[PDB]
Design a protein around this ligand. Structure first.
Ligand SMILES: Nc1nc2c(ncn2[C@@H]2O[C@H](COP(=O)(O)OP(=O)(O)O)[C@@H](O)[C@H]2O)c(=O)[nH]1
Ligand SMILES: [Mg+2]
Length: 173
């Protein structure tokens, strides 16, 4: 199998750990771990090629120790948090491109299921905000030079497989 290292970064609580666990175990977690700490390698097949994908979780609140030899980056925000999106160019892209200057980035909008959630929309409206729109994610992907923009929901599994398929294709370049 082809072996590739993936590192996932982004604001705390934007769904990184749940995304990794739903992809690798096909089950939304019932217990809380800040970062995946065991069994970090998942299999995936892309265009006939077997690829082993090592999944490196991070705390988004030492962290640069995860960056060496990375083959692809998942840079995440949450669709229920316009603030987590604004931290993409202000915090995460400067850090990732410093330690991983030419590693491909997939920009990922997590928690897609909350875009139409009424509690989410009510909480954001009291701050004069609304959920991130897909056109905003695409614009940000252009801004930071990401290989692609993907939306997903770890809760519903919608788009999860596609995120990692796109990341693997980017890593194989
Ligand atoms: N509604 C919804 N909640 C999610 C989703 N993914 C993760 N979460 C919730 O969001 C919280 C933070 O998730 P976590 O993966 O630990 O975030 P991390 O700090 O970025 O690793 C937790 O309460 C999760 O249950 C999702 O896709 N949809
Ligand atoms: Mg986590």
């Amino acid at each position: 199998a082809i072996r590739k290292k993936l590192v996932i970064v982004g604001d705390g609580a934007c769904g990184k750990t749940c995304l990794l666990i739903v992809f690798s175990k096909d089950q939304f977690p019932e217990v809380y771990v800040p970062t995946v700490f065991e069994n970090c390698v998942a299999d995936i097949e892309v265009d006939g090629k077997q690829v082993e994908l090592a999944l490196w979780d991070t705390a988004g609140q030492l962290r640069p120790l995860s960056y060496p030899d990375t083959d692809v980056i998942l840079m995440c925000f949450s669709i229920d948090s316009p603030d987590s999106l604004e931290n993409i160019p202000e915090k995460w892209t400067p850090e990732v491109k410093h330690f991983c200057p030419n590693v491909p980035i997939i920009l990922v909008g997590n928690k897609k299921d909350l875009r139409n959630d009424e509690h989410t929309r009510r909480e954001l409206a009291k701050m004069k905000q609304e959920p991130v729109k897909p056109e905003e994610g695409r614009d940000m992907a252009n801004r930071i030079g990401a290989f692609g923009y993907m939306e997903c929901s770890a809760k519903t599994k919608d788009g999860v497989r596609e995120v990692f398929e796109m990341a693997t294709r980017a890593a194989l370049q």
